[PDB]
Design a binder for this molecule. Structure first.
Ligand SMILES: Nc1ncnc2c1ncn2[C@@H]1O[C@H](COP(=O)(O)OP(=O)(O)OP(=O)(O)O)[C@@H](O)[C@H]1O
Ligand SMILES: [Mg+2]
Lengths: 471, 51, 578, 153
């Protein structure tokens, strides 16, 4: 209605929770206003409602609240965000308020931030391959339009620079796929949770240098911001991305800075509500909560738009068995894992090929899409690199002087691979150049040992010298 | 040389890791026992003492 | 004010009933003695108060009075050359009032109300003033203290006191709306002080240590963490940074550490010399002390008090360096307080909001543009104490996600008396690429190339050390023996530094540049001599090796003459053979 | 156990100002007291030694003894995996110094040695090495204390 009733009678304030006794009229999940005695207004959300009392979680801090003067009033029954096409180029905080000094958005529509599940009948297969300009991604872990491909990082590894380079260099190849029509540039939606000033300044400068701010929508939640506000940021970002993609036929790329901060924020509410913990104190419903965020990307039958997600997360002790990467790997369609050992040797980007995986690679490669010899070359490179890595552990024990010629060839191939294929710097390699380098590296091995490659492709591409590419 | 290296290097390295993993698992078991105690105490209170 | 009585006492936790109307995070007076407390939970008619002092001897029924204000510190002249309690109480007055033992209930003003200060006005009547503006100056120990408008005050000037001598509590500027401004103001310790903008750090923070200034630099306004087990050398490194850095004001926070280490600073510092101003070293240092045998709840307040003082000195245009002795004691205090609240614990019993507090504490650093218009910066170095050296503990992992530099210590190097014992393989720094334009014009154009060459030599030595211990040193070729010997020379002569030697305790950038040049020149000459058939034993027995080893003990004034002769000595020594 | 990371000695280490560690290896071969100089540490030693208290050559002698014993331990532990084929004359000198050190300086038994005779024994052990090897000691203290023979034989 046009007026709202103020609910006095708060009886308990502790941590992020607040109890109100005479609030049977509040709907479950509703958004409320918490008015301080000095006039300050804070936000909140109802998480449990009964005829006896209601439980409200508070977004902002609880400093200055008292049980005598504080009052609660309802805003809306369902949390909604006003979205419009004119919000491109704007900046917002973690709760959708402008921070760029411009007047607020006139909403065309209001959409629930929780979203709705996509009908599996209404989906379609991702088919368009994306050329990111990185050989270790284009050749062995191919990314297609509509894929969820998180990046597994560490404390000192440069995941943000890799994500910025990918967003700078991403493009599809209509000439290879036969489409012909020139693609439009990607629209970038950027969501930050608990980001520091050091990373935020780098991201802002990189986006300003390339001129991508005219096509970007930014949702920022800094490290000094309240922790509970991190729950709503990915949902708002994904609501905007889905609206733009499926209502105006945009091609949207979504980047999430750190899901570890989101999980840490969720653990506070989980521990405050005495929920049954997981393996390391995380709530047992964390798999369901993460699934509602990741599964909002994809493509829709009969529509041109698409949503692509590149989440970033940090494994704490470089641990793949930590609950957050473990639950992330069961939902997404692959992962890109960085290696600290390659980082210590000056190799950039330090992408580890063996732990990396792309589940949707087979849809976007083959004859008529990239080339006829993609998958076989990728498999042969994987097997040869695995053989070299296995031989390294043998020479670490028995010494390299007792090796045969075949083990020495594999050992040299591993070093040449690490020095030439993975290490590329800031250059933008095409798919053809990367395949040429891959065939040049495979030429070091004997021709008869290429078991996974058909002889038809061997007779066409074998025999290239590496010195004709790098001097 | 190989016998001396195996006797004086690898075996204590494995043994220390075994001890560390055992200590971590014991700590996790104690921590979950504490939570079970707390939830049993919560169960016993709301079902009998409230009017 | 709101007044109630005690109804529950349990350790440092006091529950007071009849406190309806009290607000969260306010300051209360507990008991008839008047102990300071803070409200952290409201429940109906009762309030939960944590006590910053000892609660033994209290009886149920004693009155509790709420002051209605959060925890705040007094910011103004007179904080330099002082030693303070965890809740900002001067210890030199506590000793006068109570003797050699610290007793609860002592109330002392933070700033001296009796000292006279020379006042020089800057504003005039009819002027318009905003938050952070300067309205006067007050002399200090070589500094010019600026009296600032509080950040939340706006108005017009009505009258100005003339030049003269006044105390801190005498009003000097009266606004037209009736607001009277004194020489000091109070600010809550849990609120970050406002700034205009934040800037990218591009100037180095010179620590005086070779391994930290060269291999793993930290920029002015960055953050760093130094973990390690007991006896590794955290406190010595922090005190050397306090002694030899180029920061204008140094704030030292001792949270839950030994009292002898704090007495060492109180004794040694007044007799030392300021590196840049020429006065006593204690005139630029502020100490906050909370030893391990002091009450636990005061550990949390000391960190906030120190960071608030550092933020206040930042707003005056100075460059401030903040050192925290141990954040693990702060984590232990948070764990104890949460255990008294019977909250659900996270991993290792810590509260789930541990990472948010650390993120909010390290976020206060950075180079900013002040509200007045000047430029200031705050750099934070915080030591972490993992229990068994296990750096998978939650505090270390939460710290590593926000800091820009990581100085990892090793217990293996500390047992063999190799100091500063920095593990150069596990350490990293994210500020190296931004300081290169500064290095290329302030030291030399080829300095990053020499640094990269030294790093490559160390990596090659670390690689060859596996073959050295798995096949024996006799099986190595002469080229690998040269690399092993040069790595040993580097480790013994460049990375190693003595913090107690009268000369080696401080090292300029150009001295380290000269040492690196000498080492690389020797390596190049020895590499050239190998192709000529010279035996490796002939190279190693050369007397010029001792000249490089003794180079770090030469004073700064005599070093260029040493280097100029040493280069010719190396060239002639390698020319005279074969 | 050998667990230096057990909570009790770990929490003792973070509060105190050093530690003295007994070695089981020295106890097995009969050395009493079995104090191992390598993991031991005294953080306040630098304030209590120098001119006016004890003797003015205390710190230099202590540093030289630590350096020579560390070199002897390195030489001794090099052999235990590869073999004794790589020793030179200087390595054998340091090995003999380490043997005599553990025989006499540490293995004092139930005696009541004063600081003066302890320094005398230390200087007697330092006389087994050439003056060019004593890098840590200033040559003034060498000129007036070098040349003592093994008093405990
Ligand atoms: N740079 C150095 N130069 C010389 N000696 C050093 C150096 N660093 C450490 N030491 C020696 O090692 C000791 C380590 O003591 P220190 O107080 O620095 O350790 P810490 O890491 O702070 O340990 P704790 O956790 O026990 O407080 C010093 O007292 C000193 O004897
Ligand atoms: Mg210490």
């Amino acid at each position: 209605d046009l007026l709202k009733k103020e609910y006095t009678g708060i009886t308990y304030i502790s941590g992020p929770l607040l109890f109100v006794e005479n609030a049977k009229d509040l709907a479950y999940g509703a958004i409320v206003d918490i008015k301080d005695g000095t006039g300050r207004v804070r936000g909140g959300q109802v998480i449990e409602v009964s005829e006896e009392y209601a439980v409200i979680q508070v977004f902002e801090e609880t400093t200055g609240l008292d049980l005598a003067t504080t009052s609660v009033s309802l805003v809306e029954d369902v949390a909604r965000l006003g979205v419009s096409k004119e919000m491109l180029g704007r900046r917002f905080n973690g709760i959708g308020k402008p921070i760029d000094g411009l007047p607020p958005i006139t909403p065309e529509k209001r959409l629930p931030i929780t979203g709705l599940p996509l009908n599996p009948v209404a989906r379609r297969k991702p088919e368009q391959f994306i050329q990111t300009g990185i050989s270790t991604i284009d050749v062995m872990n191919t990314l297609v339009r509509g894929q969820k491909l998180p990046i597994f990082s560490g404390s000192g590894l440069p995941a943000n620079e890799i994500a910025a380079q990918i967003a700078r260099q991403a493009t599809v190849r209509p000439d290879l796929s036969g489409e012909g029509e020139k693609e439009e540039p990607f629209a970038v939606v950027f969501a930050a949770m608990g980001i520091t000033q050091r990373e935020l300044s780098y991201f802002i400068q990189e986006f300003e240098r390339t001129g991508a701010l005219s096509r970007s929508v930014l949702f920022l939640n800094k490290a000094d911001d309240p922790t509970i506000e991190r729950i709503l940021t990915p949902r708002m970002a994904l609501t905007v991305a889905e609206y733009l993609a499926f209502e105006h036929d945009y091609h949207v790329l979504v980047i999430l800075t750190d899901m570890t901060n989101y999980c840490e924020a969720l653990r506070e509410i989980g521990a405050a509500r005495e929920e049954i913990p997981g393996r390391r104190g995380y709530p047992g419903y964390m798999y369901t909560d993460l699934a509602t965020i990741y599964e909002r990307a994809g493509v829709v039958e009969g529509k041109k738009g698409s949503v692509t997600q590149i989440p970033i997360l940090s494994m704490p002790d470089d641990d793949r068995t930590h609950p957050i990467p473990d639950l992330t790997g069961y939902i997404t369609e692959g992962q890109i894992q960085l290696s600290r050992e390659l980082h210590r040797k000056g190799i950039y980007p330090p992408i580890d090929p063996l732990p990396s995986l792309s589940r949707l690679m087979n849809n976007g490669v083959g004859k008529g899409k990239t080339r006829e010899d993609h998958k076989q070359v990728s498999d042969q490179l994987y097997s040869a690199y695995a053989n070299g890595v296995d031989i390294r552990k043998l020479v670490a024990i028995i010494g390299e002087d007792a090796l045969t010629e075949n083990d020495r060839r594999y050992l040299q191939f591993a070093d040449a691979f690490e020095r030439f294929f993975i290490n590329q710097g800031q250059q933008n390699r095409s798919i053809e150049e990367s395949l040429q380098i891959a065939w040049a590296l495979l030429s070091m091995l004997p021709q008869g040992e290429l078991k996974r490659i058909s002889k038809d492709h061997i007779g066409k591409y074998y025999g290239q010298k590496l010195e004709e590419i790098w001097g | 040389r190989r016998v001396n290296a195996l006797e004086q290097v690898v075996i204590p390295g494995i043994r220390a890791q075994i001890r560390f993993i055992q200590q971590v698992l014991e700590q996790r078991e104690r921590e979950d026992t504490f939570r079970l105690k707390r939830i049993k105490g919560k169960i016993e209170a709301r079902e009998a003492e409230e009017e | 004010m709101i007044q109630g009585v005690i109804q529950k006492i349990a350790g440092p936790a006091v529950i007071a009933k009849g406190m309806l109307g009290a607000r969260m995070y306010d300051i209360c007076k507990v008991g008839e003695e008047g102990l300071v407390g803070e409200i952290i939970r409201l429940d109906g008619d009762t309030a939960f108060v944590q006590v910053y002092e000892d609660t033994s001897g209290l009886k149920v029924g004693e009155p509790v009075v709420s002051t209605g204000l959060p925890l705040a510190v007094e910011l103004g002249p007179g904080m330099l050359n002082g030693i303070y309690d965890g809740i900002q109480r001067p210890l030199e007055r506590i000793r006068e009032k109570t003797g050699i033992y610290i007793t609860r209930g002592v109330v002392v003003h933070a700033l001296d109300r009796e000292k006279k200060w020379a006042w020089t006005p800057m504003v005039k009547p009819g002027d318009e003033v905003r938050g952070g503006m300067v309205l006067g100056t007050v002399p200090e120990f070589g500094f010019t203290h600026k009296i600032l408008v509080p950040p939340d005050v706006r108005g017009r000037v009505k009258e100005v006191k003339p030049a003269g001598e006044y105390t801190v509590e005498e009003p000097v500027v009266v606004l037209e709306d009736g607001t009277e401004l004194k020489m000091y103001h109070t600010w809550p310790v849990r609120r970050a002080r406002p700034v205009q903008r934040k800037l990218d750090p591009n100037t180095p923070f010179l620590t005086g240590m070779r391994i930290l200034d060269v291999l793993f630099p930290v920029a002015m306004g960055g953050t760093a963490a130094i973990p390690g087990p007991f006896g590794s050398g955290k406190t010595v490194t922090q005190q050397s940074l306090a002694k030899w850095s180029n920061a204008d004001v140094v704030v030292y926070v001792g949270c839950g550490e030994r009292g002898n280490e704090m007495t060492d600073v109180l004794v040694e510092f007044p007799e030392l010399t300021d590196p840049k101003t020429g006065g006593p070293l204690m005139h630029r240092t502020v100490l906050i002390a909370n030893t391990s045998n002091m009450p636990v709840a005061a550990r949390e307040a000391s960190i906030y008090v120190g960071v608030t003082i550092a933020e206040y000195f930042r707003d005056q245009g100075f460059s401030v360096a903040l050192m925290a002795d141990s954040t693990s004691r702060w984590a232990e205090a948070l764990r104890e307080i949460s255990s008294r609240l019977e909250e659900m614990p996270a991993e290792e019993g810590y509260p789930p909001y541990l990472a948010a507090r650390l993120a909010a504490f390290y976020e206060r650093a950075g180079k900013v543009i002040t509200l007045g218009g000047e430029e200031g910066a705050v750099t934070i170095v915080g030591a972490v104490s993992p229990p068994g050296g296990d750096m998978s503990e939650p505090v270390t992992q939460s710290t590593l996600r926000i800091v820009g530099a990581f100085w990892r210590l090793d217990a293996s190097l500390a047992f063999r008396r190799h100091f500063p014992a920095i593990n150069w393989n596990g350490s990293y720094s994210l500020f190296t690429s931004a300081l290169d334009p500064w290095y290329r014009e302030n030291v030399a154009e080829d300095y990053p190339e020499l640094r990269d060459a030294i790093s490559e030599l160390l990596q090659r030595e670390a690689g060859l050390q596996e073959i050295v211990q798995l096949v024996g040193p006799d099986a190595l070729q002469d080229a690998e023996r040269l690399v092993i010997e040069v790595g040993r020379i580097i480790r013994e002569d460049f990375l190693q530094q003595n913090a107690y030697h009268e000369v080696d305790a401080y090292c300029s950038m150009k001295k380290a540049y000269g040492i690196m040049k000498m080492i690389l020149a020797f390596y190049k000459e020895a590499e050239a001599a190998i192709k000529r058939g010279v035996s490796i034993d002939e190279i190693l027995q050369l007397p010029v090796l001792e000249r490089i080893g003794r180079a770090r003990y030469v004073s700064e004034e005599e070093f260029p003459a040493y280097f100029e002769e040493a280069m010719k000595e190396i060239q002639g020594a390698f020319k005279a053979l074969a």
